[PDB]
Amino acid sequence: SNADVVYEKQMLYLYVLSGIGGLLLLLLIFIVLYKVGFFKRNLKEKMEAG
């Protein structure tokens, strides 16, 4: 059923913005820690679920 929310405010722009911001901060935080030496003092696993 299509309600009157698609024209009002799906409020999805918030979920999509929060998701893109967290991923970018995760990639930058991992590289910033591995470059400074933080992650350079441990045997990472580099996991990745499918």
Instruction: Give the DSSP letter string of 1-50.
Output: ---TTTTT---HHHHHHHHHHHHHHHHHHHHHHHHHTSGGGS--------
How determined? Answer: NMR
Say which CATH topology domain 1-50 has.
Answer: 1.20.5
* One-letter amino acid for residue 12 of the chain: L
- How many Å from the N-terminal Cα to the C-terminal Cα in the chain? 32
